[PDB]
Amino acid sequence: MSLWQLETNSQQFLPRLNGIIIDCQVLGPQGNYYSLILQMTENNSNSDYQFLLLNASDLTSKLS
Amino acid sequence: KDLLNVSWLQNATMPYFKNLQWREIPNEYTVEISLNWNNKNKSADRDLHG
Amino acid sequence: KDANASHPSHSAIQSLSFHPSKPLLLTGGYDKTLRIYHIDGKTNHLVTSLHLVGSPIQTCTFYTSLSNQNQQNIFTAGRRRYMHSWDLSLTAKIEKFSRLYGHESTQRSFENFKVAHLQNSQTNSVHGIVLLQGNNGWINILHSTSGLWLMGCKIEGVITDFCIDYQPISRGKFRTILIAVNAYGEVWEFDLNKNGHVIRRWKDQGGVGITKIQVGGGTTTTCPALQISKI
Amino acid sequence: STARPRIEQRYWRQYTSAQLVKEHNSVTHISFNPQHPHDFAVTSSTRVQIFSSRTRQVIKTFSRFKDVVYSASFRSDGKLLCAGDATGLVSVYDSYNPRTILLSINASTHPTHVTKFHTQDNKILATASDDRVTRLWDISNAYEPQLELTGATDYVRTLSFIPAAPHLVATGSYDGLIRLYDTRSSGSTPIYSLNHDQPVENVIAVSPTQIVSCGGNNFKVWDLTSNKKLYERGNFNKAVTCLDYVENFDSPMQSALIASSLDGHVKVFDPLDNFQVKFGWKFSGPVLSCAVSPSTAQGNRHLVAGLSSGLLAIRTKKKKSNNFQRMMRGSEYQGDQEHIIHNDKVRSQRRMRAFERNINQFKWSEALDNAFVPGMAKELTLTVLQELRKRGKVRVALYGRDESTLEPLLNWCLKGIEDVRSASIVADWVAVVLELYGNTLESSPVLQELMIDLKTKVRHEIHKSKEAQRIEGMLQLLT
Amino acid sequence: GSIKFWDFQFATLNQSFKAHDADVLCLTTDTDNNYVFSAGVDRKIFQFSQNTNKSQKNNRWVNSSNRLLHGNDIRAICAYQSKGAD
Numbered sequence: 001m002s003l004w005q006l007e008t009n010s011q012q013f014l015p016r017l018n019g020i021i022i023d024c025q026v027l028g029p030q031g032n033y034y035s036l037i038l039q040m041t042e043n044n045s046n047s048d049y050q051f052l053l054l055n056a057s058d059l060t061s062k063l064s
Numbered sequence: 065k066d067l068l069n070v071s072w073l074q075n076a077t078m079p080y081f082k083n084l085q086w087r088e089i090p091n092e093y094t095v096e097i098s099l100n101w102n103n104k105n106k107s108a109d110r111d112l113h114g
Numbered sequence: 115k116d117a118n119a120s121h122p123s124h125s126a127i128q129s130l131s132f133h134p135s136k137p138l139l140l141t142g143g144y145d146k147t148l149r150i151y152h153i154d155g156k157t158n159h160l161v162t163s164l165h166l167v168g169s170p171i172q173t174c175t176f177y178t179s180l181s182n183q184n185q186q187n188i189f190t191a192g193r194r195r196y197m198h199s200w201d202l203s204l205t206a207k208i209e210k211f212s213r214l215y216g217h218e219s220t221q222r223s224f225e226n227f228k229v230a231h232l233q234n235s236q237t238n239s240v241h242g243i244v245l246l247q248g249n250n251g252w253i254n255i256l257h258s259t260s261g262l263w264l265m266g267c268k269i270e271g272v273i274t275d276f277c278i279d280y281q282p283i284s285r286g287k288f289r290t291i292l293i294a295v296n297a298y299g300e301v302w303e304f305d306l307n308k309n310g311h312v313i314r315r316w317k318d319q320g321g322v323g324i325t326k327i328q329v330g331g332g333t334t335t336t337c338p339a340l341q342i343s344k345i
Numbered sequence: 346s347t348a349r350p351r352i353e354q355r356y357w358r359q360y361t362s363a364q365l366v367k368e369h370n371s372v373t374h375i376s377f378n379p380q381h382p383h384d385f386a387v388t389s390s391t392r393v394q395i396f397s398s399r400t401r402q403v404i405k406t407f408s409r410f411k412d413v414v415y416s417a418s419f420r421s422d423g424k425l426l427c428a429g430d431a432t433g434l435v436s437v438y439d440s441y442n443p444r445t446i447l448l449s450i451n452a453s454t455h456p457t458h459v460t461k462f463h464t465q466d467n468k469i470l471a472t473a474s475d476d477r478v479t480r481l482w483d484i485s486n487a488y489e490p491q492l493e494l495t496g497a498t499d500y501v502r503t504l505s506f507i508p509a510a511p512h513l514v515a516t517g518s519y520d521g522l523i524r525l526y527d528t529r530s531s532g533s534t535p536i537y538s539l540n541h542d543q544p545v546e547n548v549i550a551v552s553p554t555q556i557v558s559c560g561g562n563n564f565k566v567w568d569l570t571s572n573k574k575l576y577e578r579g580n581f582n583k584a585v586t587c588l589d590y591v592e593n594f595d596s597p598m599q600s601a602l603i604a605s606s607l608d609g610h611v612k613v614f615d616p617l618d619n620f621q622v623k624f625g626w627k628f629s630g631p632v633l634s635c636a637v638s639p640s641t642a643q644g645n646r647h648l649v650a651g652l653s654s655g656l657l658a659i660r661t662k663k664k665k666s667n668n669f670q671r672m673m674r675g676s677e678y679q680g681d682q683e684h685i686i687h688n689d690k691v692r693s694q695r696r697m698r699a700f701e702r703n704i705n706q707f708k709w710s711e712a713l714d715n716a717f718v719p720g721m722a723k724e725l726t727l728t729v730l731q732e733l734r735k736r737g738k739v740r741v742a743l744y745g746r747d748e749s750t751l752e753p754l755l756n757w758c759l760k761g762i763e764d765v766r767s768a769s770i771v772a773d774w775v776a777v778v779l780e781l782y783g784n785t786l787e788s789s790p791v792l793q794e795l796m797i798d799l800k801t802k803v804r805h806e807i808h809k810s811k812e813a814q815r816i817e818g819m820l821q822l823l824t
Numbered sequence: 825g826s827i828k829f830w831d832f833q834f835a836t837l838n839q840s841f842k843a844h845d846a847d848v849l850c851l852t853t854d855t856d857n858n859y860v861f862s863a864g865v866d867r868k869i870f871q872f873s874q875n876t877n878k879s880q881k882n883n884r885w886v887n888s889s890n891r892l893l894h895g896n897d898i899r900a901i902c903a904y905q906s907k908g909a910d
């Protein structure tokens with residue numbers, strides 16, 4: 001999960017999401033929660049996604 | 065009649081209560097209450113090793 | 115009555131704060147046990163006492179949001195490279211801010227920070243800011259809810275301290291300014307509701323090494339407002 | 346989010362500092378302080394030498410004996426010590442002070458071979474010379490023993506007691522024929538005798554129920570509550586010379602007993618699972634008097650080996666200002682008497698290495714370089730070659746190199762083709778590099794010297810593999 | 825590598841960019857300062873832009889583009905503008 005600060009054009013990383021990110025946005029009204037979709041295509045048979053959000057504080061995931 | 069309500073400050077100023085039924089408790093009687101003393105703060109997101 | 119007398123402390127008292135409206139005192143020292151007392155003139159007791167290992171805290175404070183006033187986040191920091199936020203809810207949930215987005219090479223410590231509101235000034239998303247000190251001339255303004263690096267500001271010469279001055283603009287609008295010093299004692303006075311760029315700079319009449327600057331009189335960190343119009 | 350993945354006999358062989366001190370004659374046997382064996386004594390000729398657990402040399406000794414001395418034995422309190430000589434005037438004198446002699450009392454005129462105190466009583470001392478009678482002298486009135494413990498056919502030679510059972514004294518003569526007298530008896534008969542065959546070398550009691558005797562090229566056990574043997578062992582070149590027992594020490598074996606048998610190796614059996622050795626370690630010849638320290642040596646623990654030549658091998662295991670301190674005083678409180686305790690630590694893990702972080706940051710080239718250096722381990726090199734073959738593309742790992750970088754790869758496959766577990770995989774390594782790098786060797790004709798050297802040694806090794814396969818084919822035919 | 829933009833009056837820093845990974849040696853611009861192009865010994869020439877109304881109101885610069893078309897180093901750049909060439 002890579003987030004760019006625009007006015008430095010640089011990035012904060014999140015290394016091992018154990019899958020493939022499909023869609024992501026922030027959705028807190030003050031902007032504290034990142035909703036996203038993992039997919040983890042280690043089986044090509046099914047489009048078996050994985051819904052999770054994570055906090056903006058330490059980027060810990062709540063309710064995979 | 066046959067009900068006793070006791071009151072005690074759990075934190076520094078909040079009053080908690082207890083409704084002891086009165087006639088069948090022993091003569092001396094202690095009431096244990098749940099109280100945070102050295103409880104390990106456990107998150108809703110981490111295991112033992114964090 | 116001696117406010118430590120109910121449940122005493124062991125180390126020094128490096129930080130001491132009040133809740134902005136509720137009758138609550140916070141005590142924080144190097145023995146890494148931030149206590150909170152309910153204080154009154156007769157016999158004052160300990161509401162809770164959070165302890166956190168491996169982080170001897172240096173400064174810690176209360177914070178409430180200006181908008182909906184129901185947040186009550188403690189912020190605490192010591193000599194280490196992480197600080198902690200806490201939503202107090204009478205078993206605690208605390209978060210550990212350590213994600214330095216832009217600048218990662220300027221903090222040997224988090225041991226000096228302030229907290230301050232600001233407005234958005236195109237919308238009115240009034241929200242918090244942590245203001246951390248750095249090492250060369252760096253003071254970084256983060257977010258308080260999320261943790262995002264909002265921006266940073268470097269002054270020329272070594273930071274010694276800094277403070278925050280708000281000022282009203284209209285009935286419902288306000289503007290925040292950060293005041294920062296050197297040891298030499300020439301201050302920068304720059305607003306940070308727009309981007310952090312210097313709008314005033316002058317010089318103290320004297321001082322070889324100045325140590326501590328504090329603004330007051332109106333509202334500030336120690337006397338915060340509750341409604342936005344009350345600033 | 347998550348982290349990143351990472352890819353008994355050892356106790357008795359972590360015994361070291363095995364130093365040597367040669368005496369001037371042989372070492373009869375030794376002793377140990379029973380309350381705290383932090384010192385120990387060996388029975389040199391015409392002197393007894395006493396050593397500590399720290400300096401590992403003589404801390405005290407006594408050498409005004411006039412003849413060769415045989416037996417050194419502490420009392421169970423560990424204050425004084427007995428010593429029997431060839432003259433037959435057995436001397437008891439205080440330990441931790443050699444220059445005083447408490448009382449030297451004569452036994453029979455035969456050489457007093459063994460002399461040991463009572464195991465629990467502090468005032469009665471058992472002696473045995475070659476008078477075919479042993480004696481329970483009393484040191485309060487050392488003018489005549491209480492018991493003239495007679496009833497031997499020939500040469501009473503090794504004494505012991507039973508530990509928890511006081512009145513049973515187990516003596517052993519050169520007749521087999523291990524006697525065990527009652528001290529309230531007439532001193533002429535045992536209640537029964539244990540039928541060893543050889544002359545017994547010495548006997549100890551490892552239980553209050555089970556003793557072990559040794560004599561001749563096998564040692565025996567003996568039950569005392571039913572007069573029974575359950576065990577012998579005889580895997581020694583000469584007779585098992587001395588025995589020793591220890592209970593409740595720090596090992597994957599709860600209690601041990603050793604037998605030393607004049608053939609270099611000393612064997613460490615166990616009454617946990619009926620007397621099997623973990624491994625026996627040799628010495629420099631005929632091992633006569635060998636024992637480790639007892640239980641309460643407290644960590645530092647010494648095995649000593651006084652050979653029949655006389656050299657003692659000792660192998661030991663051994664496990665700003667006030668204002669600034671008041672500024673940083675609260676560092677050890679750690680949350681004892683207050684409400685909740687957080688714990689959010691990241692752990693400083695094992696030392697990640699340069700090749701490992703090269704794999705972590707895809708630094709494949711210097712990962713190969715850190716693999717092929719003599720400072721790193723050979724099996725580390727094998728494992729990183731296997732793991733990077735399993736991980737990444739060898740083509741993009743070798744996408745720009747030349748033979749001056751390729752040469753330690755070939756120089757180590759030179760010795761790694763002979764491996765059992767990495768032979769074909771390092772063959773696959775050289776297969777890929779020669780599969781895509783023929784232009785380099787046809788430009789620079791250097792490294793085909795190592796290619797042809799490789800070819801002749803791999804013809805040798807394929808002959809070796811062929812003949813090994815047909816020898817197990819012989820096993821298959823003679824199934 | 826730290827291309828730092830300081831303000832002239834008040835003598836203060838304005839922005840910073842640690843995008844260069846080596847020693848910067850040279851940098852130029854155009855007439856009304858819509859851009860600044862820098863280069864040094866990372867053999868990379870890259871851009872910063874101040875063109876839009878938001879950039880000229882807030883006085884802000886963005887690390888717009890980056891470009892490596894060199895072999896070893898840069899030790900000099902310069903730039904020219906006209907109505908016949910740019």
